[PDB]
Design a protein around this ligand. Structure first.
Ligand SMILES: *[C@@H]1O[C@H](CO)[C@@H](O[C@@H]2O[C@H](CO)[C@@H](O[C@@H]3O[C@H](CO[C@H]4O[C@H](CO)[C@@H](O)[C@H](O[C@H]5O[C@H](CO)[C@@H](O)[C@H](O)[C@@H]5O[C@H]5O[C@H](CO)[C@@H](O)[C@H](O)[C@@H]5O)[C@@H]4O)[C@@H](O)[C@H](O[C@H]4O[C@H](CO)[C@@H](O)[C@H](O)[C@@H]4O[C@H]4O[C@H](CO)[C@@H](O)[C@H](O)[C@@H]4O)[C@@H]3O)[C@H](O)[C@H]2NC(C)=O)[C@H](O)[C@H]1NC(C)=O
Ligand code: XF3
Ligand code: CA
Ligand code: CA
Ligand code: CL
Ligand code: K
Ligand code: NA
Ligand code: ZN
Length: 805
């Protein structure tokens, strides 16, 4: 109920939302059917439009007008945005040369530069170049401010997940808005685009910027605008709020445009019909900037121009139907479109089986335009699993396609030519970032970054302490002239032991053998030296990783590699080695095929054993430092130490062997050497975070050897590839992966072929940030470089994406 008989007189676009049954006058009242009777008349005036003409200059104030051109309008804060241009001989903001904003130039009583966030739905990254002739205001902000060539959204690349990620710094799995449509089985309630359930607060986790601001005494403009409030009025309302007295005036504002998404869905991302919506957004930007210029705020306010996601060409004829794969198509509920989420139609159906649904959707047609995954097997870079609202069964749909249950869903609902939601590394999904103002840099290009990082920066721009989030605070310091956040490296929690030779061969009863019984003072001191770390500078280039949790581990040195060996997990947490451009690849000699050797520095009790692998008919083993890259015959024996062995499914050893035998050398040749750090990951509860021992669900049969869910590698080299990886004087270049450790290669439809036809494609799909590995391992990398810590944080958030330009 709403008693709509109250009045909006003197309350238009009030900042504090009044509670039912009282009638509302705020920018959302329309969306709740709660505005007072007179809200349109008083608060949504339209008379005479949005622009001053010559003939209105100096007019007698008429309060019916949408905006004013009378002499008192600047003091009332309600001139039309072009008033000064038309009536006072001023130039439009866009026509002014750009001049560096070295310090905030604010009117008296402004405590801090305000922040205005201007968000554009569906604004694909390539619009900045392809539309540049029709967006002069936006192009000025872009070239005069700080810009990225694109900004990576979160998955799924849908509207509400991305806008709420922008607001919170959180992955959708953590904030809870995991799609535009959701079912929460605990609530037993459904969230949709249409309707009232979406306003209930329980969907929305984390702490969005407007709450963070409010808790720390920074006032926030209401961020949300009912769809029928036209853009011109939104801008006028922001500018009016900016003329409030100091104690009432917000410090942070938001404007949201439904365009160009709205037209993009209808016409495709580059339809001829898209030029006008881009023009109209630019004109809105021009209004805001002219309006700030009038208020003398144009060299005071920080403006962010940001998109939620891009737009791809998609038509109804490019739809895959589940009825063409599943027999039981009426026993499921599909969340459809540019991703798929599947669950049982009825919780009372005990004949529901995810495994048979997955098998029926796996590599069934030669051109199949989607791939099924149990959510835990999705690429970890998507961070799309740890929420009860994300269904176990997921379909990653190819760009340009849709998935639907049955053909009738597509015509009893062609219409549309554009859509989004695909994998967040897809080029068409990338979106935009521009920062302009005193706090941002002047005429600065920055590398692409993820939208999860922006919450921290928005907090920095307002002097707020961010709530805990998925950004890496400091990784975007290079966007800012001032207000940088100066983080320190986390403290190492566990120090390593440095064991020497402590055990005789015969103390081990591991069931292993090796043909290594073959015998020199010249080289005897040399091998001693190598076991004490004489080559450690070559193989550990960026310092040892810091262990950020309480555990027992040993540093083990070798000629060709160094490791941090966990006495709790019975395997290395990390293994570090450098392969130069000139390194040679060799075979595993015939006599050493099954060689595994006790490590006389590590007790039998803290060692794996070969017997467990012999008896576990499913599980085999591999090595972290590859025997193929041994520097000499003698050094190769180090690679068969029991302390370098890790459990691997035979199916996964095909992937791993190819990586180690072929790809490491290829990367070293291409990048002028590489440093590799590899290791295991345990994430059985798929939360993105290092498992403790008591979370491990699988061991090598009959043993306490835990089975990794994933294996990682971090591959680092010199950005200036004229310098070799191991003598690099400047910035670094990195690529990394987190490969799922799976007992089959069902994910790779061409896995019956030679590894050269499918392994690298798998690896590319599972590309990762160093930061993703940090979360999953509790390790902290790049502790000892010559580079600034903020640059290193930037490096750690880098994602090598493998898309063309
Ligand atoms: C990305 O960044 C985010 C933010 O930093 C990271 O997420 C955090 O990670 C922490 C570790 O996983 C997690 O900490 C736990 O919080 C428990 C209480 O949390 C509530 O309070 C906070 C503060 O306001 C709030 O933010 C939480 O909000 C969640 O839940 C509501 C719904 O209830 C959602 O609306 C909201 O979106 C959010 O959901 C997300 O997180 C929850 C987990 O909280 C997931 O289940 C959801 O799927 C979704 O992803 C909460 O309202 C706290 O009680 C925990 O303590 C347990 O663990 C400690 C270990 O120190 C143990 O010693 C204790 O005994 C205790 O265990 C007891 O409870 C167990 C669970 O029932 C039980 O089994 C035991 O036997 C014990 O009885 C713990 O500290 C933190 O909440 C989230 N924060 C957010 C916002 O998600 C995220 O990790 C980052 N991602 C990556 C990849 O880095
Ligand atoms: N879903 S779809 O098919 O693509 C299509 C459906 C039709 N769609 C459509 O008509 N609309 C969608 C829509 C509106 C109005 N909205 C908001 O006002 C809003 C702005 C906003 O800002 C956050 C800022 C944070 C800082 O960083 C900047 C952002 N957060 C939200 C929610 C996340 C809380 C909403 C969202 C209308 C447009 C989208
Ligand atoms: Ca959107
Ligand atoms: Ca975990
Ligand atoms: Cl969705
Ligand atoms: K075995
Ligand atoms: Na296969
Ligand atoms: Zn859309």
């Amino acid at each position: 109920w709403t008693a709509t008989s109250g009045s909006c007189k003197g309350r238009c676009f009030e900042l504090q939302e009044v509670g039912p049954p009282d009638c509302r006058c705020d920018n959302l009242c329309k969306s709740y059917s709660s505005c007072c009777h007179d809200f349109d008349e008083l608060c949504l005036k339209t008379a005479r439009g949005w622009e001053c003409t010559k003939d209105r200059c100096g007019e007698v104030r008429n309060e019916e007008n949408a905006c004013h051109c009378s002499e008192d309008c600047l003091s009332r804060g309600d001139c039309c945005t072009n008033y000064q241009v038309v009536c006072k001989g001023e130039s439009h903001w866009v026509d002014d040369d750009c001049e560096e904003i070295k310090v905030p130039e604010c009117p008296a009583g402004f405590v801090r530069p305000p922040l205005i966030i201007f968000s554009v739905d569906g604004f694909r990254a390539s619009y900045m170049k392809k539309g540049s002739k029709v967006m002069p205001n936006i192009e000025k902000l872009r070239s005069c401010g700080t810009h990225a060539p694109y900004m990576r959204p979160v998955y799924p690349t849908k509207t509400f997940p991305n806008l709420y990620t922008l607001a919170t710094g959180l992955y959708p799995e953590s904030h809870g808005i995991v799609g535009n449509s959701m079912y929460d089985p605990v609530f037993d309630a459904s969230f949709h685009l249409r309707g009232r359930e979406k306003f209930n607060h329980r969907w929305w986790g984390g702490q969005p910027l407007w709450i963070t601001a409010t808790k720390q005494g920074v006032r926030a403009g209401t961020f949300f605008w009912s769809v029928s409030i036209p853009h011109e009025r939104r801008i006028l309302t922001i500018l009016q709020w900016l003329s409030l007295p100091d104690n009432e005036r917000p410090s942070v504002y938001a404007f949201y445009s439904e365009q160009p998404d709205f037209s993009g869905h209808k016409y495709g991302p580059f339809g001829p019909e898209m030029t006008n919506p881009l023009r109209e957004i630019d004109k809105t930007v021009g209004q805001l900037m002219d309006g700030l210029k009038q208020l003398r705020l144009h060299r005071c306010v920080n403006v962010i121009f940001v998109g939620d996601h891009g737009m791809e060409d998609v038509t109804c004829d490019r739809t895959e139907f589940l009825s063409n794969y599943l027999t039981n198509v009426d026993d499921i509920t599909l969340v459809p479109g540019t991703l798929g989420r599947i669950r049982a139609k009825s919780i009372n159906n005990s004949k529901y089986d995810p495994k048979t649904i997955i098998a029926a959707l796996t590599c069934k047609k030669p051109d199949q335009h989607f791939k099924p995954y149990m959510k835990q097997h999705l690429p970890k870079r998507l961070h799309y699993a740890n929420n009860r609202r994300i269904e176990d069964i997921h379909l990653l749909v190819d760009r340009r396609w849709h998935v639907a249950r049955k053909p009738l869903d597509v015509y009893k609902k062609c219409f549309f030519q554009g859509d989004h939601g695909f994998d967040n590394k897809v080029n068409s999904m990338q979106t935009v970032f521009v920062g302009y103002g005193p706090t941002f840099k002047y005429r600065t290009k920055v590398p692409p970054f993820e939208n999860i990082e922006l919450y921290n920066v928005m907090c920095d721009l307002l002097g707020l302490k961010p709530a805990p989030n998925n950004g890496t605070h400091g990784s975007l310091n290079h966007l800012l002239r001032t207000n940088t956040f100066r983080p320190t490296m986390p403290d190492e929690v566990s120090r390593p032991n440095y064991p020497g030779i402590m055990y005789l061969q015969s103390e081990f009863d591991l069931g292993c053998t090796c043909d290594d019984k073959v015998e020199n003072k010249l080289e005897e001191l040399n091998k001693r030296l190598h076991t004490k770390g004489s080559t450690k500078e070559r193989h550990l280039l960026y310092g040892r990783p810091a262990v950020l949790y309480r555990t027992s581990y040993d540093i083990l040195y070798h000629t060709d590699f160094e490791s941090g060996y966990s006495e709790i997990f019975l395997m290395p947490l990390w293994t570090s080695y450098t392969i130069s451009k000139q390194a040679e690849v060799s075979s595993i000699p015939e006599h050493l095929t099954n060689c595994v050797r006790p490590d006389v520095r590590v007790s039998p009790g803290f060692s794996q054993n070969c017997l467990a692998y012999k008896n576990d008919k499913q599980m085999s083993y591999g090595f972290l430092f590859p025997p193929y890259l041994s520097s000499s015959p003698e050094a190769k024996y180090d690679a068969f130490l029991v302390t370098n062995m890790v459990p691997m499914y035979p199916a996964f050893k095909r992937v791993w062997a190819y990586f180690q035998r072929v790809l490491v050398k290829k990367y070293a040749s291409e990048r002028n050497g590489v440093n590799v750090i590899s290791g295991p990951i345990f994430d059985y509860n798929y939360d993105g975070l290092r498992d403790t021992e008591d979370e491990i669900k699988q061991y090598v049969e009959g043993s306490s050897i835990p089975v990794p869910t994933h294996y990682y590698s971090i591959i680092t080299s010199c950005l200036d590839f004229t310098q070799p990886a191991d003598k690099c004087d400047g910035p670094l270049s990195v690529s990394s992966f987190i490969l799922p450790h799976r007992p089959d290669n069902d994910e790779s439809c061409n896995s019956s072929e030679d590894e050269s036809k499918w392994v690298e494609e798998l690896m590319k799909m599972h590309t990762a940030r160093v930061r993703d590995i940090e979360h999953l391992t509790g390790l902290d990398f790049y502790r000892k470089t010559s580079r600034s810590y903020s640059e290193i944080l930037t490096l750690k958030t880098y994602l090598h994406t493998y898309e063309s330009e």
